[PDB]
Amino acid sequence: ESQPDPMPDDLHKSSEFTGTMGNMKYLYDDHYVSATKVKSVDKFLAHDLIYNISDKKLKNYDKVKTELLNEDLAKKYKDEVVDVYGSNYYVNCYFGKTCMYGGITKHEGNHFDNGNLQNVLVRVYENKRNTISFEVQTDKKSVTAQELDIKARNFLINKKNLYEFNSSPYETGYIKFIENNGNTFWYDMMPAPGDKFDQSKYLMMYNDNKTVDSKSVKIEVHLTTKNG
Ligand SMILES: [Zn+2]
């Protein structure tokens, strides 16, 4: 069965977060590792994989380490030709090196024809009303929930100021994936309470490498505002 939906005390509140909200913004605002048709070159811990991947733009890294939930997942992908998409960090990253979690899909067999892109509808609720809906895209048949989440958050940062440097216009926020077998799961879009944001611990949720069928999955973002 599904992860049950958030109960009230399940969700992080931005007002109980007194660190820097730019640290969350930074992770999703035009920020991702993406590499295409790659094979792992190395390992640090038993559950991760290192890839030779350069950032086209700001030439910040040329090796990426992705950590996975378990050793079996690292074994499974070790020698496969894969596509990689995820959110990267430098704070507490050790192995121009950069770190992430999950983000791996096999290359072969995993694309639509004719260079087709698949649109995935994201419906945004604010205080339980459907205010906007937009579409994110992927060329991948089986896509990581991480990658879809990243795309949807990037759009929301720009359109709805989901995150700013100081804090957020929003108190709570979660993203919900509905699979066509009935399976649902969700991620808290807000930082853990306190004065520091731990990026590595935040992104750690993506280490399950959870993938969804792009063509049938639904996405709901549910946000609440500050007062009422
Ligand atoms: Zn591919």
mmCIF file of C-alpha atoms and ligand atoms in Angstrom:
data_model
loop_
_atom_site.group_PDB
_atom_site.id
_atom_site.type_symbol
_atom_site.label_atom_id
_atom_site.label_comp_id
_atom_site.label_asym_id
_atom_site.label_seq_id
_atom_site.Cartn_x
_atom_site.Cartn_y
_atom_site.Cartn_z
ATOM 1 C CA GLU A 1 0.000 0.000 0.000
ATOM 2 C CA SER A 2 0.543 3.771 -0.319
ATOM 3 C CA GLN A 3 2.241 6.062 2.165
ATOM 4 C CA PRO A 4 -0.676 7.640 4.027
ATOM 5 C CA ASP A 5 -1.232 11.372 3.203
ATOM 6 C CA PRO A 6 0.198 14.041 5.479
ATOM 7 C CA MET A 7 -1.530 14.525 8.799
ATOM 8 C CA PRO A 8 -1.243 18.104 10.252
ATOM 9 C CA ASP A 9 1.835 17.515 12.462
ATOM 10 C CA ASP A 10 3.555 15.553 9.626
ATOM 11 C CA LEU A 11 4.432 18.743 7.693
ATOM 12 C CA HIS A 12 7.307 21.129 8.199
ATOM 13 C CA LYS A 13 6.321 24.726 8.810
ATOM 14 C CA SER A 14 8.493 27.464 7.317
ATOM 15 C CA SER A 15 7.814 29.701 10.428
ATOM 16 C CA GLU A 16 9.646 27.126 12.567
ATOM 17 C CA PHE A 17 12.603 27.399 10.150
ATOM 18 C CA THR A 18 14.975 30.232 10.976
ATOM 19 C CA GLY A 19 17.921 29.269 8.828
ATOM 20 C CA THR A 20 18.297 30.617 5.256
ATOM 21 C CA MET A 21 15.507 29.709 2.798
ATOM 22 C CA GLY A 22 17.833 30.522 -0.131
ATOM 23 C CA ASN A 23 19.463 27.128 0.755
ATOM 24 C CA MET A 24 16.256 25.430 -0.335
ATOM 25 C CA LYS A 25 15.692 27.773 -3.262
ATOM 26 C CA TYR A 26 19.261 27.023 -4.470
ATOM 27 C CA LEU A 27 18.467 23.296 -4.800
ATOM 28 C CA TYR A 28 15.586 23.758 -7.229
ATOM 29 C CA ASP A 29 16.019 27.070 -9.029
ATOM 30 C CA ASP A 30 17.687 26.170 -12.340
ATOM 31 C CA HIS A 31 19.746 23.583 -10.515
ATOM 32 C CA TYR A 32 20.285 19.977 -11.551
ATOM 33 C CA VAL A 33 22.814 17.478 -12.758
ATOM 34 C CA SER A 34 21.725 15.902 -16.037
ATOM 35 C CA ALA A 35 23.857 13.465 -17.993
ATOM 36 C CA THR A 36 22.811 11.203 -20.792
ATOM 37 C CA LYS A 37 24.002 7.657 -21.717
ATOM 38 C CA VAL A 38 26.657 7.318 -19.029
ATOM 39 C CA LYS A 39 28.264 4.330 -17.290
ATOM 40 C CA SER A 40 29.618 4.559 -13.648
ATOM 41 C CA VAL A 41 33.351 4.887 -13.297
ATOM 42 C CA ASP A 42 33.899 4.327 -9.603
ATOM 43 C CA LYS A 43 32.468 4.025 -6.098
ATOM 44 C CA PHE A 44 33.135 5.467 -2.688
ATOM 45 C CA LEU A 45 30.724 3.754 -0.258
ATOM 46 C CA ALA A 46 29.027 0.437 -1.215
ATOM 47 C CA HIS A 47 25.784 2.244 -2.047
ATOM 48 C CA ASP A 48 26.932 4.929 -4.363
ATOM 49 C CA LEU A 49 28.253 5.380 -7.880
ATOM 50 C CA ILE A 50 30.557 8.048 -9.344
ATOM 51 C CA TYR A 51 30.012 9.380 -12.852
ATOM 52 C CA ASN A 52 32.184 11.504 -15.153
ATOM 53 C CA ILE A 53 29.699 14.319 -15.807
ATOM 54 C CA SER A 54 30.608 17.996 -16.420
ATOM 55 C CA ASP A 55 28.243 20.981 -15.940
ATOM 56 C CA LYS A 56 28.013 22.679 -19.345
ATOM 57 C CA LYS A 57 27.467 26.111 -17.708
ATOM 58 C CA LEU A 58 29.493 27.294 -14.717
ATOM 59 C CA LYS A 59 32.187 24.537 -15.012
ATOM 60 C CA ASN A 60 31.812 23.576 -11.278
ATOM 61 C CA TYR A 61 32.368 19.818 -11.349
ATOM 62 C CA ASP A 62 33.470 17.058 -13.601
ATOM 63 C CA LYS A 63 32.745 14.068 -11.266
ATOM 64 C CA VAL A 64 29.324 13.290 -9.747
ATOM 65 C CA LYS A 65 28.682 10.865 -6.905
ATOM 66 C CA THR A 66 25.148 9.555 -6.529
ATOM 67 C CA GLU A 67 24.218 7.761 -3.285
ATOM 68 C CA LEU A 68 21.487 5.119 -3.394
ATOM 69 C CA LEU A 69 19.312 3.636 -0.628
ATOM 70 C CA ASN A 70 21.190 0.315 -0.612
ATOM 71 C CA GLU A 71 24.011 -1.696 -2.106
ATOM 72 C CA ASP A 72 21.645 -3.728 -4.364
ATOM 73 C CA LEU A 73 20.569 -0.560 -6.180
ATOM 74 C CA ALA A 74 24.233 0.377 -6.658
ATOM 75 C CA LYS A 75 24.986 -3.131 -8.021
ATOM 76 C CA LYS A 76 22.014 -3.012 -10.355
ATOM 77 C CA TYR A 77 23.194 0.127 -12.113
ATOM 78 C CA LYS A 78 26.938 -0.132 -11.701
ATOM 79 C CA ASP A 79 27.594 -1.366 -15.268
ATOM 80 C CA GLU A 80 24.465 -0.123 -17.001
ATOM 81 C CA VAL A 81 24.296 2.674 -19.507
ATOM 82 C CA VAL A 82 21.997 5.169 -17.713
ATOM 83 C CA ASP A 83 20.601 8.658 -17.756
ATOM 84 C CA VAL A 84 21.142 10.748 -14.703
ATOM 85 C CA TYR A 85 18.947 13.604 -13.405
ATOM 86 C CA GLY A 86 18.982 15.128 -9.940
ATOM 87 C CA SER A 87 19.577 17.942 -7.549
ATOM 88 C CA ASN A 88 23.242 18.313 -6.480
ATOM 89 C CA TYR A 89 25.019 19.697 -3.394
ATOM 90 C CA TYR A 90 28.632 20.646 -2.142
ATOM 91 C CA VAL A 91 28.124 21.072 1.660
ATOM 92 C CA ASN A 92 29.244 17.801 3.328
ATOM 93 C CA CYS A 93 30.121 16.299 -0.026
ATOM 94 C CA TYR A 94 33.230 14.074 0.054
ATOM 95 C CA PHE A 95 34.582 11.134 -2.051
ATOM 96 C CA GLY A 96 35.315 19.833 -9.010
ATOM 97 C CA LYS A 97 33.325 17.067 -7.378
ATOM 98 C CA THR A 98 29.531 17.237 -6.591
ATOM 99 C CA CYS A 99 27.055 14.909 -4.873
ATOM 100 C CA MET A 100 23.408 13.886 -5.219
ATOM 101 C CA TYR A 101 21.012 10.964 -4.483
ATOM 102 C CA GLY A 102 19.142 8.555 -6.796
ATOM 103 C CA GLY A 103 18.464 10.111 -10.247
ATOM 104 C CA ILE A 104 19.292 7.006 -12.305
ATOM 105 C CA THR A 105 17.195 5.425 -15.109
ATOM 106 C CA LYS A 106 18.452 2.839 -17.640
ATOM 107 C CA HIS A 107 18.933 4.365 -21.040
ATOM 108 C CA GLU A 108 17.908 1.533 -23.392
ATOM 109 C CA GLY A 109 14.213 1.123 -24.002
ATOM 110 C CA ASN A 110 13.305 4.200 -21.996
ATOM 111 C CA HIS A 111 12.411 6.884 -24.552
ATOM 112 C CA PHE A 112 9.402 7.774 -26.706
ATOM 113 C CA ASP A 113 9.714 7.838 -30.519
ATOM 114 C CA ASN A 114 10.232 10.731 -32.973
ATOM 115 C CA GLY A 115 11.920 12.733 -30.197
ATOM 116 C CA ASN A 116 8.500 12.902 -28.419
ATOM 117 C CA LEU A 117 8.258 14.615 -25.033
ATOM 118 C CA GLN A 118 5.752 13.535 -22.362
ATOM 119 C CA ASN A 119 3.826 16.218 -20.506
ATOM 120 C CA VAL A 120 3.024 15.510 -16.857
ATOM 121 C CA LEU A 121 0.214 17.673 -15.399
ATOM 122 C CA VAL A 122 0.994 19.308 -12.073
ATOM 123 C CA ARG A 123 -2.080 20.657 -10.204
ATOM 124 C CA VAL A 124 -1.341 23.267 -7.555
ATOM 125 C CA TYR A 125 -3.621 23.704 -4.548
ATOM 126 C CA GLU A 126 -3.385 26.703 -2.284
ATOM 127 C CA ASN A 127 -5.423 26.353 0.935
ATOM 128 C CA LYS A 128 -7.280 23.442 -0.726
ATOM 129 C CA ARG A 129 -8.247 25.332 -3.910
ATOM 130 C CA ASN A 130 -6.872 24.459 -7.436
ATOM 131 C CA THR A 131 -5.438 27.812 -8.483
ATOM 132 C CA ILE A 132 -2.937 26.846 -11.182
ATOM 133 C CA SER A 133 -1.975 23.806 -13.202
ATOM 134 C CA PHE A 134 1.006 23.426 -15.441
ATOM 135 C CA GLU A 135 2.894 20.784 -17.352
ATOM 136 C CA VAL A 136 6.440 19.493 -16.826
ATOM 137 C CA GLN A 137 8.190 17.400 -19.505
ATOM 138 C CA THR A 138 10.410 14.453 -19.883
ATOM 139 C CA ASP A 139 11.687 12.336 -22.746
ATOM 140 C CA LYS A 140 11.730 9.349 -20.297
ATOM 141 C CA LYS A 141 9.085 6.643 -20.103
ATOM 142 C CA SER A 142 10.028 5.593 -16.535
ATOM 143 C CA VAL A 143 11.158 8.882 -14.889
ATOM 144 C CA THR A 144 12.434 9.528 -11.337
ATOM 145 C CA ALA A 145 9.946 11.217 -9.109
ATOM 146 C CA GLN A 146 13.030 13.367 -8.193
ATOM 147 C CA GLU A 147 13.312 14.784 -11.704
ATOM 148 C CA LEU A 148 9.591 15.582 -11.954
ATOM 149 C CA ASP A 149 9.713 17.185 -8.474
ATOM 150 C CA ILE A 150 12.725 19.320 -9.478
ATOM 151 C CA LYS A 151 10.971 20.566 -12.655
ATOM 152 C CA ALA A 152 7.778 21.388 -10.794
ATOM 153 C CA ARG A 153 9.552 23.239 -7.973
ATOM 154 C CA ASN A 154 11.658 25.261 -10.464
ATOM 155 C CA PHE A 155 8.435 26.434 -12.201
ATOM 156 C CA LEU A 156 6.853 27.301 -8.780
ATOM 157 C CA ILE A 157 9.872 29.251 -7.579
ATOM 158 C CA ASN A 158 9.637 31.526 -10.652
ATOM 159 C CA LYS A 159 5.872 31.765 -11.005
ATOM 160 C CA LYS A 160 4.786 31.598 -7.353
ATOM 161 C CA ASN A 161 7.956 32.541 -5.419
ATOM 162 C CA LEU A 162 7.745 29.132 -3.767
ATOM 163 C CA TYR A 163 11.101 29.896 -2.033
ATOM 164 C CA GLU A 164 12.902 33.213 -1.546
ATOM 165 C CA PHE A 165 16.173 34.077 0.160
ATOM 166 C CA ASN A 166 14.690 34.885 3.525
ATOM 167 C CA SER A 167 11.692 32.545 3.722
ATOM 168 C CA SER A 168 8.584 31.489 1.828
ATOM 169 C CA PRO A 169 5.081 32.998 1.217
ATOM 170 C CA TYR A 170 3.983 29.469 2.286
ATOM 171 C CA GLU A 171 3.732 27.806 5.664
ATOM 172 C CA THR A 172 3.478 24.140 4.563
ATOM 173 C CA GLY A 173 3.976 22.472 1.143
ATOM 174 C CA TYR A 174 3.947 18.847 -0.072
ATOM 175 C CA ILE A 175 4.157 17.200 -3.434
ATOM 176 C CA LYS A 176 2.035 14.091 -4.106
ATOM 177 C CA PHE A 177 2.577 11.477 -6.780
ATOM 178 C CA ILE A 178 -0.445 9.315 -7.793
ATOM 179 C CA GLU A 179 0.567 6.187 -9.770
ATOM 180 C CA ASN A 180 -1.863 4.395 -12.146
ATOM 181 C CA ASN A 181 -1.787 1.280 -9.882
ATOM 182 C CA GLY A 182 -3.319 3.450 -7.091
ATOM 183 C CA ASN A 183 0.000 3.936 -5.329
ATOM 184 C CA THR A 184 0.551 7.401 -3.828
ATOM 185 C CA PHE A 185 3.558 8.931 -2.053
ATOM 186 C CA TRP A 186 4.567 12.510 -1.085
ATOM 187 C CA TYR A 187 7.589 14.710 -0.178
ATOM 188 C CA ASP A 188 7.548 17.674 2.235
ATOM 189 C CA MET A 189 8.579 20.735 0.327
ATOM 190 C CA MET A 190 9.614 22.649 3.508
ATOM 191 C CA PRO A 191 12.892 22.472 5.507
ATOM 192 C CA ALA A 192 13.171 20.726 8.908
ATOM 193 C CA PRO A 193 12.797 23.177 11.872
ATOM 194 C CA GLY A 194 15.792 25.106 13.221
ATOM 195 C CA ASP A 195 18.398 27.656 12.202
ATOM 196 C CA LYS A 196 20.459 25.501 9.837
ATOM 197 C CA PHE A 197 19.389 23.760 6.587
ATOM 198 C CA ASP A 198 21.146 20.428 5.993
ATOM 199 C CA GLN A 199 20.982 19.979 2.174
ATOM 200 C CA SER A 200 22.457 16.498 2.186
ATOM 201 C CA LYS A 201 19.929 15.235 4.698
ATOM 202 C CA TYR A 202 17.094 16.968 2.818
ATOM 203 C CA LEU A 203 17.965 15.437 -0.601
ATOM 204 C CA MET A 204 18.529 12.070 1.049
ATOM 205 C CA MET A 205 14.807 11.229 0.495
ATOM 206 C CA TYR A 206 15.575 10.787 -3.248
ATOM 207 C CA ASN A 207 18.004 7.896 -2.523
ATOM 208 C CA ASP A 208 15.215 5.273 -3.087
ATOM 209 C CA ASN A 209 15.548 6.101 -6.865
ATOM 210 C CA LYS A 210 11.755 5.943 -7.026
ATOM 211 C CA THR A 211 10.596 6.023 -10.674
ATOM 212 C CA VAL A 212 7.106 6.533 -12.117
ATOM 213 C CA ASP A 213 5.432 6.012 -15.492
ATOM 214 C CA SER A 214 5.542 9.534 -17.043
ATOM 215 C CA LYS A 215 2.584 8.816 -19.302
ATOM 216 C CA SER A 216 0.110 7.927 -16.494
ATOM 217 C CA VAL A 217 1.396 9.514 -13.257
ATOM 218 C CA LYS A 218 -0.420 12.467 -11.660
ATOM 219 C CA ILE A 219 1.076 15.163 -9.489
ATOM 220 C CA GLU A 220 -0.562 17.381 -6.914
ATOM 221 C CA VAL A 221 1.245 20.173 -5.073
ATOM 222 C CA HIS A 222 -0.548 21.233 -1.899
ATOM 223 C CA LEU A 223 0.550 24.485 -0.233
ATOM 224 C CA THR A 224 -0.865 26.522 2.650
ATOM 225 C CA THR A 225 -0.298 30.250 3.207
ATOM 226 C CA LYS A 226 0.984 31.986 6.338
ATOM 227 C CA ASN A 227 -2.080 33.299 8.322
ATOM 228 C CA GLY A 228 -5.436 32.182 6.844
HETATM 229 ZN ZN ZN B 1 18.496 8.003 -22.486
#
